Design a protein around this ligand. Structure first.
Ligand SMILES: [Fe+2]
Length: 658
C-alpha cells in the first residue's frame, strides 16, 4: 500500500520558506491522513497500511497559514500501489481559508439519481457554494446580466487576474497614458487643419496594415473592404430588396436603374446603421458631438472587390423627407465626409453592438452561468472553463473604467454619456441566436460563398473545427438525446443563460432547454466561438484599422452635411475628431487589440480538467485541425495584398480577456 502523490502548483505567495497543507486520500472504502510540506512539480511518497480502494476524493486544508499567504493549486495526481494508472484530481482553484477543499476524481461525471453517491453530494454542495459566491447583477435595465461585482475587488478570487496578466494590464494602461502625454506635448501647439495633420499623432502604436490603411484610406475599395474584412465584418449584408429608408431624390434616375439592375443581378450589398437612429450623442468637454444612422449601398464587382454606390448619412425624417444621397461622383470632400460618417457609425456599432455586447457580455453570461449551474465534476464545465477565463474581470473593468458613467467611452466616443447604454438596449433585442452563429449569421446576411469575404470563410472553417471539438466532447459524455434531457444541471445552465443571463431571450431564438445532442452541440459551439473566435475577429482589427483616426472616427464634432457643394476642408476637419478624442481612440484600440504575453491560444490551454484519455484525444484533434487551418490561412494570406489575419488560430485567444 504505497501511495505516490504529485502536487502541481500554478501560482503561490508565501512569506515563509515552506507551508503546511493537510491532505486526505479519500477512497471508496476509507481515507488516509497525510502530512505534506509545500515547497513550490513536487512529489511526496507515503505508505498506508489500510486499503483505500478506488481513490475518489482529495481534501485540502491550509494548515496554520497567515492571512497574506495564498496558493493556486493546479492538479493533484496520485499514483496508487501496483501497476494501476495515475489518478488525477484537477483543482485549478485558489484555496481559500482553513476549510475543507474536496477535489473529486478527474473523470467527468453527469449527475445521477443516487443522492447517496458521494460525487452527487459533492456536486450539489459545490453548486450551492458556487451559486452563493457567483451571483447575477443588473448593470443596466434591458441589458444582459453581469456578475455581482461593482469593482474588480468584489469578484470571486478564483476568476481574478493572475499576476502577469494584471501587471501587463496596468503596464499597458500606464503606457497608453504616457503615450497620450507625449502626444499632448507634441500636438499642443500644432495646428489641425488638413488630413495630413493626423500623421502627427499616427506614430508608435501602429502596424504594417495600419500603415497601409494610412496610405490608402481615401480609396473607395478599402472603405468597402472594411465591411467584409475590416474590424467590423458583422454588419454588411446582401440586399434582398432596396431599403425603404433609401428615398431617392428625383433627378437620380441613373442611380435607381443601377441599383435595380444589380439588385436583380444579386451583387447589391447594404450596411444599414439604422440602429443609431435617434441615439442621443455625447457632449465632450462642453462640445456637442453628433451621430447619424447611415446606409451605404455596395456593389460586388466581378473582380472580387466591393465598391460603394450611395451613402445616405441620415435616415428620412418628417423634417427632411428626402435626405442628401452622397455618391462617389460627388465633390471629393463631400464623398470623403460621407465615408467618414459611415466609418464613424461602423466604429459605433462595432465597439458597442458587435464587440461589447455580442462577444463580451455574451461571454460574461456564459461564464456566470457556467460557474453557477455547472459543477466541477460536470464535463461541460470542464469544456467551458478554459474558454471563460478572465472574462468576468475584463467585463468588470470595462463596466468600471471603460463604459461607466464618466468613463473613457464617454470622454471619446460619440455615443457616450448614456447613448451607448440606449444603443446597447437596442442591440440586445437584435442579439439573436442566429446572429452569434456564423453559419446562420452569414447565411442571413448572404455572405456564404462570397470569395472576397475572408472573415466568412475563416469563420465557417473555425465553426466546423470548433463544432468537431464540441461534438467529440459531447458525444463522449452525452451518448443519447435523453441523456442530454436527463441532465438537470445542463438544463439549469441553459436556462441560466437564456431566461436569466440574456434576460428572457426566448424571442431571440436562444434555447430555453436542450432537447437533443445536436442542439447542445450547436449551443456549445456558439459559446466557444463567441468566447474565442468571434472575439478575435471583432477585437484584433482595432489597431490595424482604427489607429488611423480618419479611417474610422470615434466621434464627429459637426452635423452631417446636407449640401455637397458646401463641404470644404474646414468642414471635414471640423467634423473629424480633434487631438484628444483621436489620441484616446488610438490608445483604447491599442490597449484592447494588442497581443497579450499571457495569451492562451485557442485549444492550447495547459490546464487538464479532464482526466480520461479520450477528451485529451478530442482536444488534440482540435489542436491538429486548428494547426491545419492556420497553415491554410497563412498560405492564403501570403498571396493577398490585404490579408485577413485575425482568425489565425495561433492569434485567437482562448477566452475573452481583453
Ligand atoms: Fe475586447
Amino acid at each position: 500500500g504505497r501511495y505516490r502523490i504529485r502536487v502541481a502548483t500554478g501560482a503561490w505567495l508565501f512569506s515563509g520558506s515552506y507551508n503546511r497543507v493537510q491532505l486526505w486520500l479519500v477512497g471508496t472504502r476509507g481515507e488516509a491522513e497525510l502530512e505534506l510540506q509545500l515547497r513550490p512539480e513536487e512529489e511526496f511518497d507515503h505508505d498506508v497500511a489500510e486499503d483505500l480502494g478506488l481513490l475518489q476524493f482529495v481534501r485540502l486544508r491550509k494548515h496554520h497559514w497567515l492571512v497574506d499567504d495564498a496558493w493556486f493549486c493546479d492538479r493533484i495526481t496520485v499514483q496508487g500501489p501496483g501497476a494501476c494508472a495515475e489518478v488525477a484530481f484537477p483543482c485549478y482553484r485558489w484555496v481559500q481559508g482553513e476549510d475543507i477543499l474536496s477535489l473529486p476524481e478527474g473523470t467527468a461525471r453527469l449527475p445521477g439519481d443516487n443522492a447517496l453517491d458521494m460525487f452527487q453530494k459533492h456536486r450539489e454542495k459545490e453548486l450551492k457554494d458556487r451559486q452563493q459566491i457567483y451571483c447575477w447583477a443588473t448593470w443596466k435595465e434591458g441589458l444582459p446580466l453581469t456578475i455581482a461585482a461593482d469593482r474588480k475587488d468584489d469578484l470571486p478570487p478564483n476568476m481574478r487576474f493572475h499576476e502577469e496578466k494584471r501587471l501587463d494590464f496596468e503596464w499597458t494602461l500606464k503606457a497608453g497614458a504616457l503615450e497620450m502625454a507625449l502626444k499632448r506635448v507634441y500636438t499642443l501647439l500644432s495646428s489641425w487643419n488638413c488630413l495630413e495633420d493626423f500623421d502627427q499623432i499616427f506614430w508608435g502604436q501602429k502596424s504594417a496594415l495600419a500603415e497601409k490603411v494610412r496610405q490608402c484610406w481615401q480609396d473607395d475599395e478599402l472603405f468597402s473592404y472594411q465591411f467584409l474584412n475590416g474590424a467590423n465584418p458583422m454588419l454588411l449584408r446582401r440586399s434582398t430588396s432596396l431599403p425603404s429608408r433609401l428615398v431617392l431624390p428625383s433627378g437620380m434616375e441613373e442611380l435607381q436603374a443601377q441599383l435595380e439592375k444589380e439588385l436583380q443581378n444579386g451583387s447589391l450589398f447594404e450596411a444599414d446603421f439604422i440602429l443609431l437612429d435617434g441615439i442621443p450623442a455625447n457632449v465632450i468637454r462642453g462640445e456637442k458631438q453628433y451621430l447619424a444612422a447611415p446606409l451605404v449601398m455596395l456593389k460586388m464587382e466581378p473582380n472580387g472587390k466591393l465598391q460603394p454606390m450611395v451613402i445616405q448619412i441620415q435616415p428620412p425624417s418628417p423634417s427632411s423627407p428626402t435626405p442628401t444621397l452622397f455618391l462617389p461622383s460627388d465633390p471629393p470632400l463631400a464623398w470623403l465626409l460621407a465615408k467618414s460618417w459611415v466609418r464613424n457609425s461602423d466604429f459605433q456599432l462595432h465597439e458597442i453592438q458587435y464587440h461589447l455586447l455580442n462577444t463580451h457580455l455574451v461571454a460574461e453570461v456564459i461564464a456566470v452561468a457556467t460557474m453557477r449551474c455547472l459543477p466541477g465534476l460536470h464535463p461541460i464545465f470542464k469544456f467551458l472553463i478554459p474558454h471563460i477565463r478572465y472574462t468576468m474581470e475584463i467585463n468588470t473593468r470595462a463596466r468600471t473604467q471603460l463604459i461607466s458613467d464618466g468613463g473613457i467611452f464617454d470622454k471619446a466616443v460619440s455615443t457616450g454619456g448614456g447613448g451607448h447604454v440606449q444603443l446597447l438596449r437596442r442591440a440586445a433585442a437584435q442579439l439573436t441566436y442566429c446572429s452569434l452563429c456564423p453559419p446562420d449569421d452569414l447565411a442571413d446576411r448572404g455572405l456564404l460563398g462570397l470569395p472576397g469575404a475572408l472573415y466568412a470563410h475563416d469563420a465557417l472553417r473555425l465553426w466546423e473545427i470548433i463544432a468537431r471539438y464540441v461534438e467529440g466532447i459531447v458525444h463522449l459524455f452525452y451518448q443519447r438525446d435523453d441523456i442530454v434531457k436527463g441532465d438537470p444541471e445542463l438544463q439549469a445552465w441553459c436556462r441560466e443563460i437564456t431566461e436569466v443571463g440574456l434576460c428572457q431571450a426566448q424571442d431571440r431564438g436562444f434555447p430555453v432547454s436542450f432537447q437533443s445532442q445536436s442542439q447542445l452541440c450547436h449551443f456549445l459551439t456558439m459559446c466557444v466561438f463567441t468566447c474565442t473566435a468571434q472575439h478575435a475577429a471583432i477585437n484584433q482589427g482595432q489597431l490595424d484599422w482604427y489607429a488611423w483616426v480618419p479611417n474610422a472616427p470615434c466621434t464627429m464634432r459637426m452635423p452631417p452635411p446636407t449640401t455637397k457643394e458646401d463641404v470644404t476642408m474646414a468642414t471635414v476637419m471640423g467634423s473629424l475628431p480633434d487631438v484628444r478624442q483621436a489620441c484616446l481612440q488610438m490608445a483604447i484600440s491599442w490597449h484592447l487589440s494588442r497581443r497579450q504575453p499571457d495569451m492562451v491560444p485557442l485549444g492550447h490551454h495547459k490546464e487538464k480538467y479532464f482526466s480520461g484519455p479520450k477528451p485529451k484525444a478530442v482536444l488534440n484533434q482540435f489542436r491538429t485541425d486548428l494547426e491545419k487551418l492556420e497553415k491554410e490561412i497563412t498560405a492564403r494570406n501570403e498571396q493577398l495584398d490585404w490579408p485577413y489575419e485575425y482568425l489565425k488560430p495561433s492569434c485567437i485567444e482562448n477566452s475573452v480577456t481583453i
